[PDB]
Design a protein around this ligand. Structure first.
Ligand code: SF4
Ligand code: SF4
Ligand code: FES
Lengths: 66, 80, 143, 97
């Protein structure tokens, strides 16, 4: 049993200080090793103000959409 | 002296420490990330407040933050 | 645990012609800084205040007026040349203070003898509203 | 398309297959040969490495010297392997100098 959403899923962001907040992104890797507080790696379709397109997130800041 | 704070979303890329022009920041060992690294700010009495560190941080939102505070001789960058 | 070097005066200085950018009254009454390095040979380099100087073969000792001057000079010396430098803060009392590198290693490399100063264990979006700290002298990021 | 990749590494040298539209790092992530990363966004030097042969697409690479892409170093996480490549891993500091 692994953790988190599946690889390449479609998830919605709930971290309101995020640029992509209430938007969606695609999972690319979920660090399985505990002691990491932000395992999920999400890649987005648009860049933010710092010209970055990927970010780490916790498990509860991510909600699977369909 | 300004304030500089490090938040636990840090990925330990060290880009902020490389950028500081007055050597305020430092890397210290940790266990909360793949790098086992975290930034710290032990020498904030020398911080000029340029936010050169914030331009370098890649996390969203920032993991290093500079709050401008009471001014001194070193903080203002006065050579006289 | 890494005794820091001592300041060895009688260390020579680079070959400079003088300039209107050097020390001022603040160095007489408040503080100034001193950088020292190695210089395998004699070479020319850009002064962080004015024109160009010649560093001598062997130890070199420069007196500047700001920490940022010392650190910019050290960055130039460390990348473009392959040179080790240290700098110090001297008071009008005649008191030295080894400044950098603090614990012998450069701060971009993690050393196991360091404590955390100014680290909050949460995201930046989880600071309280200012209304929570009103009339008490703390700040929302203090926590 | 899906050219074979070669990575020298302190663990050894292993190969995995993976299409040209991908970044090297997620593809070494697929088969499971662990590599060092911090950013996954092309804004640091933990995923640094150099090449033995061929050359890798560095279009979406940034925060690099106007030379780091003409004398060997490459960031594995923003790189497209246009050819059957042979690359280095754990190459940050001899890049960091
Ligand atoms: S604001 Fe400037 S001087 Fe202060 S810690 Fe950041 S980079 Fe250093
Ligand atoms: S730039 Fe940001 S993420 Fe990188 S080490 Fe500094 S505080 Fe941490
Ligand atoms: S993690 Fe630093 S470049 Fe990919």
């Amino acid at each position: 049993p692994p953790i988190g959403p599946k690889r390449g899923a479609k998830v919605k962001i709930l971290r309101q200080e995020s640029y992509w907040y209430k938007g969606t992104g695609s999972v690319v890797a979920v660090d399985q090793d505990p002691n990491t507080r932000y395992p999920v790696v999400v890649r987005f379709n648009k860049v933010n103000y710092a010209n970055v397109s990927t970010n780490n997130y916790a498990l509860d800041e991510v909600e699977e959409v369909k | 002296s300004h304030s500089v704070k490090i938040y636990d979303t840090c990925i330990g890329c060290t880009q902020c420490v490389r950028a500081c022009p007055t050597d305020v920041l430092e890397m210290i060992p940790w266990g909360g990330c793949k790098a086992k690294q975290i930034a710290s700010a032990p020498r904030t009495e020398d911080c000029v407040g340029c936010k050169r560190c914030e331009s370098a941080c890649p996390t969203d939102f920032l993991s290093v933050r500079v709050y401008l505070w009471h001014e001194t001789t070193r903080s203002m960058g006065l050579a006289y | 645990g890494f005794t820091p070097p001592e300041l060895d005066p009688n260390t020579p200085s680079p070959i400079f012609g003088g300039s209107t950018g050097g020390l001022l009254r603040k160095a007489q009454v408040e503080e100034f800084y001193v950088i020292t390095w190695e210089s395998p040979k004699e070479q020319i380099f850009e002064m962080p205040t004015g024109g160009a100087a010649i560093m001598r073969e062997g130890p070199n000792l420069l007196k500047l007026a700001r920490k940022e001057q010392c650190l910019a000079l050290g960055t130039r010396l460390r990348s473009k040349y392959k040179i080790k430098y240290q700098f110090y803060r001297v008071f009008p009392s005649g008191e030295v203070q080894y400044l950098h590198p603090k614990d012998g290693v450069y701060p971009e490399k993690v050393n196991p003898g360091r404590q955390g100063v100014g680290v909050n264990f949460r995201s930046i979006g989880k600071n309280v509203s200012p209304i929570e700290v009103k009339f008490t002298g703390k700040q929302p990021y203090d926590l | 398309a899906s050219y074979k990749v070669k990575l020298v590494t302190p663990d050894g040298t292993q190969e995995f297959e993976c299409p040209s539209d991908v970044y090297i790092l997620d593809h070494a992530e697929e088969v499971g040969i662990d590599l060092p990363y911090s950013c996954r966004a092309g804004s640091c030097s933990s995923c640094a490495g150099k090449v033995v042969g061929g050359e890798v697409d560095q279009s979406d690479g940034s925060f690099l010297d106007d030379e780091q892409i003409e004398a060997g170093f490459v960031l594995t996480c923003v790189a497209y392997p246009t050819s059957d490549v042979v690359i280095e891993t754990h190459k940050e500091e001899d890049l960091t100098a």
